[PDB]
């Protein structure tokens, strides 16, 4: 009920400590010079236990903490949106319907519309200007209400940069296409696709400037627009450009700094929580946290200190640099010798050393493609037969 | 709750004050919040979600799943430029890397000079202006191995300043005569 | 110290809130199916977050057993039968049970979550209606 008598009880226990029948024990200040300090010691030990519970049950941090570190907290999480590709992106068609027949129908429609999109890219202007708009595969997204078709496109030759603003007064052969995709009122292709899908349809032509930022566009461009440079033999200048598209980055250093940045992120969040655990809590008396099920420390601004959209989001993103690429030309790309030929151009590395020293773990797309790899084959026909361009790219 | 009419209008646009008010009057005080460890819903950083940030929120007027504009409300009509460029400095250069430039690409003598200055401290200006280059033999060399005939490019080159300095160098490459002669020129400059 | 962050924005950073059941009747049963547990659980959290604001007691994302379709196919276009390769498809199932809520509020919940459904998820809703033995249907 109240310690006013438990104090007397403990005094009797001290008397017993000396002897069971003695008046009192060795008392410098009547058992008050350091007995109170020892009482405070046990109270603060109880605070230690409750406090580490307090911090542990309120921890959530991105993965990437090097185990060698000491200040790293016990918590970890690899599923941060910025550090792993959602497995729904693995499949070109992203749908689930309780009606399997409808599911099959929809995948058929997706494939056919994708082929139509391919066929709908080539353009003519004046019978000696052939413009091909290379496009990746289509990412079909089937929500419960609307369908979305998303793809990355690369124009063969953007208007010259040195050219003046003259482009503002006419619409390019590609702008016309992208506008009729979804901007025309009662004529856009989305309206037509709505009949096949009985849903509201959307299309997103995301633009890409370089062909080597995507495996589909890169192989497509080599196999469709660069035939003359390898038909009778790979040109040395073409090989030089293809091999020096990207500089020689230090994968080890890149990975090490990424891991160190994650370490700093976690450690400074931990410090924020610790300073709220100690510096704060003064006015608010203890036991109001109710550590059994409640874990609210304080103001979210204080739990997340100096973590804005301006510093955190960009430095934790993964698959940002291209640190390796391989190109395989195979088939009858030679008038001489009338046989099969394989030529391999391999540059860089094909291993993400980020996963080798940190707690971030690789995930295999479709259970056979490492997350850091994107690859594609494209086959075309020349006067001698069919030939294949196979491209593999490693992103770190 | 935390703050009622505490200058909240100065910090949030008037259009959202109704939502904050409703939240205050529906979520009770002393709510026993708990962080989620199974699933993640909030960003790792801290944001009030009151401003649409380019490159981190969907661009208005452009089609995208999770959009709320109709087919007659899209305001994007040009596709000749990359929508939503990068934020901040607009570049993602790693630490200790430089944007590619001319770099003496017009003359491999500049690359040779830079490399030899790096390795042994000779004068790039002297190598690039006061040295003359001349191939002597450029021939194909073959090795027979388990896989088959592995052809190699062999070059020999004389480099001299026409005032007493002279040297020759041999270079062997597996891919191109240009790399062969580059190596040969490197070796010659070393062996002046 | 800094700009205030009200409860509405502070709630996003914590687990979704629930409203206790006061009677116990099951008005609706929403089963979410997908091949991607990530979107499945994210969308389930969104549902449990909207239910609180709309006043619908929702139980939570009960994980029902996952279903594994299996196929085996030869790896060669022509005769090589000693080598075969297996393919699988996992269906992940979550369940959210809605108790003690009016039909119109429940309607509007389902309508909003359909408005903002993610990609690769599917909803099966079982609605329960209490009725009297004899109904005047004229």
């Amino acid at each position: 009920l109240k310690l006013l008598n438990m104090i007397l009880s403990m005094m009797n226990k001290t008397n017993n400590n000396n002897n069971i029948i003695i008046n009192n024990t060795l008392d410098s200040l009547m058992n008050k010079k350091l007995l109170l300090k020892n009482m405070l010691l046990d109270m603060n030990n109880k605070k230690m236990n409750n406090m580490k519970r307090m911090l542990n049950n309120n921890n959530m941090n991105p993965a990437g903490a090097n185990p060698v570190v000491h200040r790293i907290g016990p918590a970890g999480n690899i599923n941060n949106k910025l550090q792993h590709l959602n497995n729904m992106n693995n499949w070109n068609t992203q749908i689930y319907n309780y009606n399997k027949n409808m599911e099959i129908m929809n995948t058929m429609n997706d494939k056919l519309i994708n082929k139509l999109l391919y066929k709908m890219m080539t353009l003519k202007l004046n019978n000696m200007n052939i413009n091909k708009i290379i496009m990746s595969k289509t990412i079909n997204q089937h929500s419960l209400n609307k369908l979305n078709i998303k793809f990355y496109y690369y124009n063969n030759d953007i208007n010259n940069n040195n050219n003046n603003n003259n482009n503002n007064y006419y619409m390019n052969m590609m702008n016309k296409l992208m506008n009729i995709m979804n901007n025309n009122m009662n004529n856009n292709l989305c309206n037509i696709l709505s009949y096949y899908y009985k849903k509201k349809v959307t299309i997103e032509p995301i633009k890409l400037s370089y062909i080597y930022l995507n495996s589909d566009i890169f192989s497509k461009y080599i196999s469709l627009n660069d035939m003359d440079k390898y038909n009778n033999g790979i040109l040395t200048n073409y090989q030089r450009m293809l091999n020096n598209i990207m500089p020689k980055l230090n994968d080890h250093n890149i990975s090490m700094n990424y891991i160190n940045n994650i370490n700093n992120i976690n450690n400074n969040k931990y410090n924020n929580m610790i300073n709220l655990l100690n510096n704060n809590n003064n006015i608010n008396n203890n036991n109001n946290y109710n550590n059994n099920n409640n874990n609210y420390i304080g103001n979210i601004n204080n739990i997340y200190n100096n973590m804005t959209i301006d510093n955190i989001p960009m430095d934790i993103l993964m698959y940002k640099y291209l640190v390796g690429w391989s190109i395989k030309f195979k088939g009858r790309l030679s008038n001489n010798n009338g046989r099969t030929s394989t030529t391999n151009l391999l540059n860089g590395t094909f291993n993400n050393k980020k996963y080798l020293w940190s707690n971030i773990n690789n995930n295999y797309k479709l259970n056979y493609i490492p997350s850091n790899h994107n690859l594609y084959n494209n086959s075309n026909i020349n006067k001698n037969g069919k030939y294949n361009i196979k491209v593999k790219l490693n992103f770190i | 709750q935390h703050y009622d009419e505490s200058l909240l209008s100065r910090y949030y646009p008037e259009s959202l004050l109704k939502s904050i008010k409703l939240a205050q009057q529906t979520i009770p005080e002393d709510t026993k919040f708990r962080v989620s460890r199974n699933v993640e819903f909030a960003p790792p950083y801290l944001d009030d979600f009151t401003k649409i940030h380019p490159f981190w929120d969907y661009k208005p007027g452009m089609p995208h799943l999770h959009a709320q504009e109709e087919n007659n409300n899209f305001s994007i009509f040009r596709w000749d430029q990359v929508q939503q460029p990068l934020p901040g400095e607009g570049n993602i250069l790693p630490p200790g890397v430089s944007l590619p430039n001319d770099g003496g690409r017009k003359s491999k003598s500049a690359d040779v000079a830079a490399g030899l200055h790096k390795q042994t401290g000779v004068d790039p200006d002297y190598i690039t202006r006061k040295l003359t280059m001349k191939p002597l033999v450029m021939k194909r060399v073959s090795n027979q191995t388990g896989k088959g005939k592995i052809a190699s490019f062999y070059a020999l080159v004389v480099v001299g300043d026409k005032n007493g300095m002279v040297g020759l160098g041999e270079g062997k490459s597996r891919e191109e005569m240009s790399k062969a002669i580059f190596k040969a020129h490197w070796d010659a400059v070393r062996n002046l | 110290s800094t700009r205030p962050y009200p409860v509405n924005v502070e709630a996003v950073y914590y687990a979704p809130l629930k409203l206790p059941i006061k009677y116990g009747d099951l008005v609706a049963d929403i089963q979410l199916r997908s091949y991607d547990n990530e979107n499945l659980d994210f969308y389930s959290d969104f549902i449990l977050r909207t239910g609180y604001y709309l006043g619908i007691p929702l139980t939570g994302p009960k994980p029902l057993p996952t279903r594994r379709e299996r196929w085996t196919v030869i790896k060669s276009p022509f005769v090589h039968a000693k080598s075969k390769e297996n393919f699988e498809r996992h269906t992940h199932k979550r369940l959210i049970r809605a108790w003690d809520t009016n039909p119109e509020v429940l309607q509007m919940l389902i309508a909003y979550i359909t408005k903002h459904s993610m990609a690769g998820v599917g909803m099966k809703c079982n609605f329960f209606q209490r009725s009297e033995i004899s109904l005047d249907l004229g």
């Binding site: - | 259009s15 959202l16 009151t50 401003k51 940030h53 380019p54 208005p60 | 309607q107 509007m108 408005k115």
Partner: peptide, 22 residues
């Protein structure tokens, strides 16, 4: 980096056409 956020409450009229079919 700043762009105004316009709001429109989800009225039942807006959520219409997405009520359960049965």
């Amino acid at each position: 980096v700043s762009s105004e956020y316009v709001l429109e409450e989800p009225t039942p009229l807006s959520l219409l056409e997405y009520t359960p079919q049965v």
